[PDB]
Amino acid sequence: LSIVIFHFSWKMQSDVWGTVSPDGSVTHVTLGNFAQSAITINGWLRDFLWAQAANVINSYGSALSAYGIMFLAGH
Amino acid sequence: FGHLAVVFVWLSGMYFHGAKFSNYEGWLADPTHIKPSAQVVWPIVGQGILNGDVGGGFHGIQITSGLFYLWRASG
Amino acid sequence: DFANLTPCSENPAYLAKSKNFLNTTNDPNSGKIRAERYASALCGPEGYPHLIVDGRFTHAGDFLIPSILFLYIAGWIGWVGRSYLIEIRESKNPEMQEVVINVPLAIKKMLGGFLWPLAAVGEYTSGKLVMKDSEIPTSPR
Amino acid sequence: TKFPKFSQDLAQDPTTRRIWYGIATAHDFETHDGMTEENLYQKIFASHFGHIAIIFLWTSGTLFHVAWQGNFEQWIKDPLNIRPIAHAIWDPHFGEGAVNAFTQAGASNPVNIAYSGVYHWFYTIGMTTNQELYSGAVFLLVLASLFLFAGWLHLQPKFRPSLAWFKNAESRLNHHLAGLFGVSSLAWAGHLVHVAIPEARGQHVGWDNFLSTPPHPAGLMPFFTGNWGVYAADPDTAGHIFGTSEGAGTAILTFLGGFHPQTESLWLTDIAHHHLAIAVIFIIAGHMYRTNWGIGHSIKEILNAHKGPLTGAGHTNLYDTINNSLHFQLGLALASLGVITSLVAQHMYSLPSYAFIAQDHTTQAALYTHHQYIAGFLMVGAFAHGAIFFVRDYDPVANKDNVLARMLEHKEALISHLSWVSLFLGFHTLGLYVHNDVVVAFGTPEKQILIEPVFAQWIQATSGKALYGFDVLLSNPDSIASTTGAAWLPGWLDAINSGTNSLFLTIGPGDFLVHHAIALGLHTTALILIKGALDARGSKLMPDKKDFGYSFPCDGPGRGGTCDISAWDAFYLAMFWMLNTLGWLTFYWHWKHLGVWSGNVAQFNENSTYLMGWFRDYLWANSAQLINGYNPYGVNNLSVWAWMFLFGHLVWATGFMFLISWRGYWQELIETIVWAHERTPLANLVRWKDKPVALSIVQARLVGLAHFTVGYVLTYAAFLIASTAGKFG
Amino acid sequence: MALSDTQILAALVVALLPAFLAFRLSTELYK
Amino acid sequence: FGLYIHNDTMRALGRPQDMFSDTAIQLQPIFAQWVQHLHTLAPGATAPNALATASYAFGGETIAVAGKVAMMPIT
Amino acid sequence: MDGSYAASYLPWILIPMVGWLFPAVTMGLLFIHIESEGEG
Amino acid sequence: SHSVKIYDTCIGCTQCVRACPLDVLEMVPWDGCKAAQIASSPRTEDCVGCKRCETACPTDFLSIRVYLGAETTRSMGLAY
Amino acid sequence: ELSGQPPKFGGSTGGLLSKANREEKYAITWTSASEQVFEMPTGGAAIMNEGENLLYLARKEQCLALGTQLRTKFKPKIQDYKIYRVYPSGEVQYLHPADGVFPEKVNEGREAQGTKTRRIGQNPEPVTIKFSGKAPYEV
Numbered sequence A: 001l002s003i004v005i006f007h008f009s010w011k012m013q014s015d016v017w018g019t020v021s022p023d024g025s026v027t028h029v030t031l032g033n034f035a036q037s038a039i040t041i042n043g044w045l046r047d048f049l050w051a052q053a054a055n056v057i058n059s060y061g062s063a064l065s066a067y068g069i070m071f072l073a074g075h
Numbered sequence B: 001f002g003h004l005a006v007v008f009v010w011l012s013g014m015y016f017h018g019a020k021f022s023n024y025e026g027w028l029a030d031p032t033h034i035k036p037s038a039q040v041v042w043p044i045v046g047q048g049i050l051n052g053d054v055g056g057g058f059h060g061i062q063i064t065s066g067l068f069y070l071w072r073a074s075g
Numbered sequence C: 001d002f003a004n005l006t007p008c009s010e011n012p013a014y015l016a017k018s019k020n021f022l023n024t025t026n027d028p029n030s031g032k033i034r035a036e037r038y039a040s041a042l043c044g045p046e047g048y049p050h051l052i053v054d055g056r057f058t059h060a061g062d063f064l065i066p067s068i069l070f071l072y073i074a075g076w077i078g079w080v081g082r083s084y085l086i087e088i089r090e091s092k093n094p095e096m097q098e099v100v101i102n103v104p105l106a107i108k109k110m111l112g113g114f115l116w117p118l119a120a121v122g123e124y125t126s127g128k129l130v131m132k133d134s135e136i137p138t139s140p141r
Numbered sequence D: 001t002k003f004p005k006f007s008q009d010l011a012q013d014p015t016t017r018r019i020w021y022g023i024a025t026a027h028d029f030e031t032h033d034g035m036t037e038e039n040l041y042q043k044i045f046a047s048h049f050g051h052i053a054i055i056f057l058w059t060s061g062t063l064f065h066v067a068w069q070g071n072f073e074q075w076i077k078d079p080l081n082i083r084p085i086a087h088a089i090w091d092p093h094f095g096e097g098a099v100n101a102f103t104q105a106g107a108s109n110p111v112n113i114a115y116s117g118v119y120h121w122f123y124t125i126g127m128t129t130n131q132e133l134y135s136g137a138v139f140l141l142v143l144a145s146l147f148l149f150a151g152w153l154h155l156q157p158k159f160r161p162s163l164a165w166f167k168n169a170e171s172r173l174n175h176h177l178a179g180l181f182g183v184s185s186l187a188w189a190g191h192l193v194h195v196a197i198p199e200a201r202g203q204h205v206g207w208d209n210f211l212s213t214p215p216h217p218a219g220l221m222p223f224f225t226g227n228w229g230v231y232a233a234d235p236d237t238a239g240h241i242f243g244t245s246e247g248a249g250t251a252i253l254t255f256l257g258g259f260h261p262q263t264e265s266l267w268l269t270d271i272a273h274h275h276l277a278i279a280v281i282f283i284i285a286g287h288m289y290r291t292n293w294g295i296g297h298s299i300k301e302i303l304n305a306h307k308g309p310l311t312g313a314g315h316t317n318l319y320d321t322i323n324n325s326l327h328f329q330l331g332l333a334l335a336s337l338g339v340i341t342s343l344v345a346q347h348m349y350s351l352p353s354y355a356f357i358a359q360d361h362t363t364q365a366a367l368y369t370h371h372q373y374i375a376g377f378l379m380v381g382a383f384a385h386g387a388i389f390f391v392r393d394y395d396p397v398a399n400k401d402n403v404l405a406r407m408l409e410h411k412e413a414l415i416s417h418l419s420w421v422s423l424f425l426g427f428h429t430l431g432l433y434v435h436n437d438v439v440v441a442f443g444t445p446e447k448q449i450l451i452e453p454v455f456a457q458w459i460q461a462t463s464g465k466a467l468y469g470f471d472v473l474l475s476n477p478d479s480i481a482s483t484t485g486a487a488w489l490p491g492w493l494d495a496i497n498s499g500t501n502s503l504f505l506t507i508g509p510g511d512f513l514v515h516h517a518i519a520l521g522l523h524t525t526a527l528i529l530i531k532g533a534l535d536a537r538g539s540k541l542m543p544d545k546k547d548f549g550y551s552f553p554c555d556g557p558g559r560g561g562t563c564d565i566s567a568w569d570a571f572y573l574a575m576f577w578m579l580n581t582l583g584w585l586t587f588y589w590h591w592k593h594l595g596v597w598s599g600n601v602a603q604f605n606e607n608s609t610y611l612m613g614w615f616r617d618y619l620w621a622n623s624a625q626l627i628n629g630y631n632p633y634g635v636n637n638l639s640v641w642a643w644m645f646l647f648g649h650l651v652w653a654t655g656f657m658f659l660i661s662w663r664g665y666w667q668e669l670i671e672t673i674v675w676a677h678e679r680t681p682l683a684n685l686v687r688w689k690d691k692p693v694a695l696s697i698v699q700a701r702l703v704g705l706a707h708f709t710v711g712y713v714l715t716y717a718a719f720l721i722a723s724t725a726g727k728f729g
Numbered sequence E: 001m002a003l004s005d006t007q008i009l010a011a012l013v014v015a016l017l018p019a020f021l022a023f024r025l026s027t028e029l030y031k
Numbered sequence F: 001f002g003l004y005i006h007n008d009t010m011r012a013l014g015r016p017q018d019m020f021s022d023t024a025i026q027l028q029p030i031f032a033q034w035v036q037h038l039h040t041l042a043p044g045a046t047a048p049n050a051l052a053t054a055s056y057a058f059g060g061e062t063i064a065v066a067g068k069v070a071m072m073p074i075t
Numbered sequence G: 001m002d003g004s005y006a007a008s009y010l011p012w013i014l015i016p017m018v019g020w021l022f023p024a025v026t027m028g029l030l031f032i033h034i035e036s037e038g039e040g
Numbered sequence H: 001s002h003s004v005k006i007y008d009t010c011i012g013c014t015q016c017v018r019a020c021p022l023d024v025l026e027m028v029p030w031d032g033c034k035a036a037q038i039a040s041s042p043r044t045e046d047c048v049g050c051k052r053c054e055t056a057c058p059t060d061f062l063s064i065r066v067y068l069g070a071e072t073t074r075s076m077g078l079a080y
Numbered sequence I: 001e002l003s004g005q006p007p008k009f010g011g012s013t014g015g016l017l018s019k020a021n022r023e024e025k026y027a028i029t030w031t032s033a034s035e036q037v038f039e040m041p042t043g044g045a046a047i048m049n050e051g052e053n054l055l056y057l058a059r060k061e062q063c064l065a066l067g068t069q070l071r072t073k074f075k076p077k078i079q080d081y082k083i084y085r086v087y088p089s090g091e092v093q094y095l096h097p098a099d100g101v102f103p104e105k106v107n108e109g110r111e112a113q114g115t116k117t118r119r120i121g122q123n124p125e126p127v128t129i130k131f132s133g134k135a136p137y138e139v
Ligand code: CLA
Pocket: D088, D089, D090, D091, D092, D093, D098, D112, D639, D640, D643, F008, F009, F010, F012, F013, G015, G018, G019, G022, G023, G026, G027
């Protein structure tokens, strides 16, 4: 289930979710990197885990810092 | 029957926290400027930083369970 | 003494931070009284207060006072528990009162722990504190 | 079957376990069939000959690959901007991108950059050409040949020696302290004054002109006639360039206590003065025990002569205890080697002695990490072999009432007090770290609890370093120890007060918190190892444990359950805590050195006091160049370190399989697989010779631990080398 | 300067001697 | 997983043309693509009374409520 | 792959020898040895 | 095969024999206990090493002890 | 020879492997008053015949688990089962109960083997028996 939800999170941020321009173009959250990075374990480590963990570790001093603390606490 | 009682206590607490300590009023008139927030945390030991600005002069944890969207879907 | 550090009211990082210390409670003066309290400490170059545990009497609030207060409270807790365990040993089921706790004798000992170090030295001098090595159960040596 | 030859109990075993146990018991020479003590010692002696030859062939290969495929003379010309080359890559799996990425350090072929310090060591000893390296490699080849023939010859009749010379402790220790320790130190001091200083002050001293060159103008005669201060006439000046005659002195034995300004290593002449003094003390200490004439001590007499009032028999019969137990000897030797390996690590980063090795940051990181890992292994092995001594070699009657049996007597006191102090350290270090993390996360990092390391700063002050204002001992100008002349003192004050060295680095409360974490790790690893060694013979749960041996799975689910009750299992548990402590210390050392080398010490000084700073500013931040060693856009030279990083993660997690899942599930699964093979047509023609079974319980623990350790080591080595070679190298 | 081909082959011919001696020592240690 | 390991090794060795990817040796999920196509031609041919498709993840156009995305064809 | 060093044909021959010939020969001899039902 | 030894603290409760799933142990007549019987292990070649007999033994520091030794097809419990 | 009707069974994958015809198998014989269903130790249910029943199994432990089921899970307790070991040469060796009496009950003529005249705590030290090839419990 960790792999299932990691697949879901990366594919939804890469090929679905994002911001739509008024002209009709969509800028995705992680800019479509799933097609080239999710084929390697290193891509999963760097572009999914390392890249998206920057929000949870740079949360201290803000309202998201509790999510930082549990990120330590589960560890 | 005891388990159903526990689940009903949980659901009653969810409706009470969505009515007294929430911003369902304010989110409903303006959906996409205000994020859902239904938990208000006391200012103590510096934990009032977690009461983040979610919109419309509210300070609370942004709830992600989707209670507001189901409540809007129920009328 | 402590040349690598500075008093907080001279360390300009401390003033630049204590101008904007966040209020923890609903009192608006909480950051201000935090600044007034922390200005008398010894701050580093980063501005946060640092504590000295060497045993300086002027730094008695850094180590000495909370340590002796913790020692007094921990002795109270330990002596209350030890006297409860000594008293309930002479009973029919001493395991029962260990798992369903007899309230009034525990309360009587709880409001009896305000003279604990005198009781500790009296029990040490009367032989009621330390048993012998032959008296206690031992593993095969 | 035949294999193993040494165990008929394992040879009769019809399962695959036989083969595994035939691998795992091959060097347990005592438990072999028909083993006497005499053949045990002779086989050990031949295996030592083989191991010495293996070490020499390893060195010869290092020399041959530096000479044949390295860039040693090109690095000789510029040993500050040219990367050393270990060996050339011949991998047919490489693509064009990896071939271009590993064609580095001026080579025309793919090469690896050496990080062992090898180029700096052969520069500091005066080697300058690949031909000398080739000649030395051929020399180590023929030396290994001589050692292999020596082992074979001393396994022959009329050359196999008796049991008496093996137990001859006095003569052997005199021989090792004098001929192997002191004479070798004297010979290396001779090499230093004959090559290393005259090659630092540029000259060619080869074997051709070896006979006719004086290292000093005034030769050996003022050494013989009187005062040797002539050899302290003029040291190398503070303008000296290494390998040239510019700024060169002529003196070969001086002292000024510090570093040569250019290379930032220890003074080579100071090294020679140290080495000659240490060789003289080793020569003196080597005339302490009896010989074939009768003037020295016998160790048994000194051991039997030391007693005390409240200690029982004192040191009675520890001579026969140590001399008849190879496991006691191994425990003492491994403990001493681990302590001095930790000393080697903690001294070489802070007082480097190899020319320009202090500017090679990745090399220094690799050396320190390697030696601390080796030290952790040796210390764990020392405690494990002490447990093996207690299981197999301990005589409670011959050791009655001495220090050994007294340690057995109060073993509960030792174990309980170690447990108390481990709980103390862990409780308060975790409480302070979590308090700091919580109040930093609440936007208010000024309510953190920060204790200055006042005692450690005072120890810094009482060595010369004046950056704290204590003004005591060597920091105090008017103290008695400061006014002694003693010309190491001003150079030592300059070396310890200039902040361009790792010598006595300035410390804040983050250093203090991680030092107490290191203390917790040391105390808990010692607690596990000491409880295992002192319960190896028995406990209240299992009092006949000495009848079951050092290593056994359990005593079953009876009596409450007894998993991991052997002393081998306590070794296995302490491996994890040793790796944890070593990871903590290496993390701290690397983060401090990344702060020092880059000049940004404030990141450590304001972020190491809480664990989110360790998580973010050390682990997350320094992996970015490592994990981009290969990416969808291409590769660089860190591609191998990214791959090894992932490989180590995989091996660590594979060890988690054997550590978490236990045997019987796998045995039932293998039973179903056995059924499948026995019922499949065209594969029923093929039968196994050994019956497939699951790995044993002890084998499961050992295999999971081996994978855990290999993954731990490879992951951290990849991270360390890639982060330091991307940021600096 | 770099080494020669004949130097490398002579080193391998030399290394044939500890190979044979290691074979002899391992054979003698086996029995 | 050995396909992932193969890809990690071939990318690390500088052989991206030997990987398993869309720009290399392709592993196209052709049955899932065919079922997505059949769901796209469902509303009007095999689902005549259905106006739109069951979900736009199968194929269609991107719903762009506010400036954000809600659903697009997940390729 | 190539080399500017002396006798660059030697990695060309010895990498398959140490990677394929030596381990296949060693495991074949060891597999024949550890299954030998000779005497014990 | 594994070794099963019976020591003189045996009080003849027969619980180790009842607990043994491979018929290793019997009870033979004895005189050292009030039950006048001691456990015996004539069939240790069938012992698998499960230590159920040790779990059943009520004497403190059990009078029956199983020592795992040489491993056979019978001792590893192999049906193949 | 071994006599008895085989219990009627549909067959299972849990039964005999090549060890049965290669090294050894085991047999259990028992007399049954009626036809009732028992549980196979190799998984599943079998029906035992009225009269003599002869079952072939892979291990001695499977036969003894079946015998425990026969003694404990049937209201008329089948207490007369015999367990044998069968070799591929054809020799049948009788195993259980060896003297005709279940081993939890004492019998005269049973010799004490594996019995130690010393206590558990008076085994000698391992250091006293080094390079002898024998354990503390074997001396
Ligand atoms: C498919 C994966 C793969 C494979 C198979 C290889 C294969 C190889 N690489 Mg390699 N490499 C890879 C991926 C791979 N690479 C990747 C992804 C990178 C990152 C870009 C690299 C980077 C790289 C570098 C930088 C180097 C190599 C080198 C080598 C060669 C080492 C051969 C050797 O010294 O003796 C064979 C191997 C060993 C002796 C290692 C021993 C380890 C085993 C476990 C010991 C077992 C002992 C045990 C007791 C077993 C019994 C003994 C047995 C004989 C019975 C070999 C051709 C090196 C080279 O060119 O060699 C000169 C080298 O310098 N590789």
